[PDB]
Design a protein around this ligand. Structure first.
Ligand SMILES: C=C1C[C@](OC)([C@H](O)C(=O)N[C@@H]2OCO[C@H]3[C@@H]2O[C@H](C[C@H](O)CO)C(C)(C)[C@@H]3OC)O[C@H](C)[C@@H]1C
Ligand SMILES: [Cl-]
Ligand SMILES: [Cl-]
Ligand SMILES: [Cl-]
Ligand SMILES: [Cl-]
Ligand SMILES: [K+]
Ligand SMILES: [Mg+2]
Ligand SMILES: [Mg+2]
Ligand SMILES: [Mg+2]
Ligand SMILES: [Mg+2]
Ligand SMILES: [Mg+2]
Ligand SMILES: [Mg+2]
Ligand SMILES: [Mg+2]
Ligand SMILES: [Mg+2]
Ligand SMILES: [Mg+2]
Ligand code: NA
Ligand code: NA
Ligand code: NA
Ligand code: NA
Ligand code: NA
Ligand code: NA
Ligand code: NA
Ligand code: NA
Ligand code: NA
Ligand code: NA
Ligand code: NA
Ligand SMILES: [Sr+2]
Ligand SMILES: [Sr+2]
Ligand SMILES: [Sr+2]
Ligand SMILES: [Sr+2]
Ligand SMILES: [Sr+2]
Ligand SMILES: [Sr+2]
Ligand SMILES: [Sr+2]
Ligand SMILES: [Sr+2]
Ligand SMILES: [Sr+2]
Ligand SMILES: [Sr+2]
Lengths: 194, 145, 92
RNA sequence: GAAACAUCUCAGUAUCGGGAGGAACAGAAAACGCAACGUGAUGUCGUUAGUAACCGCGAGUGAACGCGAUACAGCCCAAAC
RNA sequence: ACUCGUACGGUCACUGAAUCCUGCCCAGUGCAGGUAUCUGAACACCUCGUACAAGAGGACGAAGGACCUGUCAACGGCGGG
RNA sequence: GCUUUACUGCAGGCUGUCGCUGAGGACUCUCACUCCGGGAGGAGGACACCGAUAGCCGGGCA
């Protein structure tokens, strides 16, 4: 039958209706007063967490990040940068907020590696994401048959090289066919036209 | 002794006034510059013309002239010698991947031929029957209606 | 010059002779669903556009008479050239 | 560069910020669509092709499927119980 | 920043000690204020349109503008007959 | 380099609108949110702030 999990999930399908609506209105007040990276004992969205790879083990950390909202905060132009080149309040950046989050998080934890992240709400001027990080040095995880992969030296700073799932989903790598000619196998490998 | 070879001493290497062979000005602009002003002479006029049908909606038929067949009847010993009978499909190169094979009539037909192809031109027939011969439309070609 | 509302003339159709009216093209509006309503937003953004950032041009000291020759029995029309006329009166 | 110039080009180049490895990235289809009784992860090379497509439809820009090759290797969770 | 500051303040301009004075002009331009009426984008909204969408018309209507007033120690003007 | 009622844009100010945003064409409220207070608590209040968009002005700038 339905798993208790499928309930948490089925609820966040519309974080603005019912109990969850009352929760967020409350939590946020507390959230809005927390740092920019708060570690938390348990994931707010359990289904999602586990689903994304979470495990109630040793070395599996969760942290809620809070990034300022908006689009782009771009200066005008020092020298003589023409019209098509005067970006300031009408353009946005090529990296989505969740990626910014994942990064700030991994920095706060200079030894942990990003596993994944999820949204947990957003008031009128900031977005919150919980990021699942992992200690590649705790044997507790070095042994785990489902997570020991995140230990390869070539997984170091995996988030800063866009290896997160959201990382890849942003580098235009979702589709295996049409419209991904300039993305895969690498944006840089494609003279950045993706 | 090449031309280049004799240039040492010319100073201008054919150019003319040492003031000629300078920048892109001498060429009237880089590339197709002024292709419609000073160097407009002999430049397909400006504009858009007609349309194109999507590439995967295009039929490319493999064609051959009765003449080609006829000229090699005897040399095609590896084929039928009916009361000659030949399935063109096995004669045209580039056949394997052609939307279909069509026999175009052009030239004499000094033979009685039993040709078999996806489609023939109204003329290829005349030239075939008129040579005491028949022509057969492949099962495929049976979509002529 | 004026213009007889209904004169006897030929037409690139019935290979005969009937009566052709005189009506100055009332034209039509901007579809909104054309190849220019889309590339007007695609050839823009921030800065200039060239042909889209351009404006309408002047006119000659006169306007040729653009018409449409409708038919009697038929009901359809064709298109001929126009004449530089300050005005025009389709008499009756 | 467009023989000026704003879109366009130069060019996602120069330069800057962050990060990994001896290689990186990619990768086992919500694919393809020579529409098929067809192919079967991924890079890469030859070609497809200066083709399709874009574009003050100007100057210019410019793929892919397929094919021939190189090398080949497929798997693990979340949930149900 | 001004600012450990608060209109006897400090900001932004002009003229350039004292002394005698500092005329007329608000049409244009600027600034400010008002405004029946008119004009005035997008969203939501009504009608039609599309099994949806593109779309057509309507409706309401902000700042702004029209319009009206104030202002020249505000830009400036002080002629011809 | 500089100027402007040159062309084209951008900051920026003004304004409508959408989100933040809640309870009962004019109104009440308090609970988000903002400010004052050491605090208790006070003021303000779905406005303001911020994200987005739309119209006007826009040599301050390119
Ligand atoms: C006769 C002339 C006309 C035109 O052709 C040469 C050209 O047609 C034009 O410039 N304006 C036209 O306006 C009426 O019909 C169209 C045309 O295009 C407009 C867009 C414009 O091309 C770019 O901004 C438009 C808005 C699509 C408009 O829609 C009604 O160029 C010169 C002006 C030349 C003098
Ligand atoms: Cl990481
Ligand atoms: Cl074609
Ligand atoms: Cl007319
Ligand atoms: Cl195939
Ligand atoms: K330039
Ligand atoms: Mg034009
Ligand atoms: Mg030039
Ligand atoms: Mg590569
Ligand atoms: Mg030109
Ligand atoms: Mg390019
Ligand atoms: Mg393809
Ligand atoms: Mg002085
Ligand atoms: Mg304070
Ligand atoms: Mg300037
Ligand atoms: Na780290
Ligand atoms: Na792209
Ligand atoms: Na020379
Ligand atoms: Na083939
Ligand atoms: Na587009
Ligand atoms: Na030039
Ligand atoms: Na110049
Ligand atoms: Na262009
Ligand atoms: Na005045
Ligand atoms: Na004077
Ligand atoms: Na200078
Ligand atoms: Sr590191
Ligand atoms: Sr020469
Ligand atoms: Sr030179
Ligand atoms: Sr010309
Ligand atoms: Sr072949
Ligand atoms: Sr475009
Ligand atoms: Sr524009
Ligand atoms: Sr004239
Ligand atoms: Sr294989
Ligand atoms: Sr005045």
């Amino acid at each position: 039958a339905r798993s208790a999990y499928s309930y948490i999930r089925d609820a966040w399908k519309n974080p603005g209706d019912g109990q969850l609506a009352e929760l967020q209105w409350q939590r946020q007040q507390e959230w809005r007063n927390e740092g920019a990276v708060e570690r938390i004992e348990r994931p707010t969205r359990l289904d999602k967490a586990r689903s994304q790879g979470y495990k109630a083990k040793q070395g599996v950390i969760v942290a809620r990040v809070s990034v300022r909202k908006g689009s782009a905060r771009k200066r005008r132009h020092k020298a003589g940068r023409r019209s098509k080149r005067q970006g300031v309040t009408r353009i946005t950046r090529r990296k989505d907020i969740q990626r910014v989050a994942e990064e700030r998080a991994s920095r706060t934890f200079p030894n942990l590696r990003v596993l994944n992240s999820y949204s947990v709400g957003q008031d009128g001027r900031q977005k919150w994401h919980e990021v699942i990080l992992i200690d590649p040095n705790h044997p507790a995880i070095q042994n785990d048959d489902d997570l020991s992969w995140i230990c390869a030296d070539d997984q170091a700073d995996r988030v800063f090289r866009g290896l997160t799932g959201a990382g890849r989903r942003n580098r235009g790598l979702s589709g295996k066919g049409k419209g991904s000619e300039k993305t895969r196998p690498s944006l840089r490998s494609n003279g950045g036209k993706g | 002794t090449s031309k280049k070879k004799r240039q040492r001493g010319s100073r201008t290497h054919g150019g003319g006034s040492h003031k000629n062979r300078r920048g892109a000005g001498h060429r009237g602009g880089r590339g197709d510059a002024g292709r419609d002003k000073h160097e407009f002479h002999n430049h397909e006029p400006l504009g858009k013309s007609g349309f194109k049908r999507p590439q995967k909606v295009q039929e490319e038929a493999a064609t051959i002239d009765v003449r080609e067949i006829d000229e090699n009847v005897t040399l095609l010993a590896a084929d039928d010698v009916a009361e000659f009978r030949v399935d063109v499909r096995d004669v045209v190169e580039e056949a394997d991947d052609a939307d279909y094979v069509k026999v175009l009539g052009a030239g004499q037909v000094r033979h009685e031929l039993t040709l078999i192809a996806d489609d023939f031109s109204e003329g290829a027939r005349e030239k075939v029957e008129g040579a005491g011969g028949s022509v057969e439309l492949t099962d495929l070609g049976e979509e002529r209606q | 010059m004026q213009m007889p509302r209904r004169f006897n003339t030929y037409c690139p159709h019935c290979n005969e002779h009937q009566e052709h009216e005189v009506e100055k093209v009332r034209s039509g509006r901007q579809t909104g669903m054309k190849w220019i309503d889309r590339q007007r937003e695609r050839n823009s953004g921030i800065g200039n556009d060239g042909k889209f950032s351009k404006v309408p041009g002047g006119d000659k000291p006169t306007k040729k008479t653009d018409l449409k020759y409708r038919c009697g029995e038929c009901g359809k029309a064709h298109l001929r050239e126009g004449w530089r006329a300050g005005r025009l009166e389709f008499q009756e």
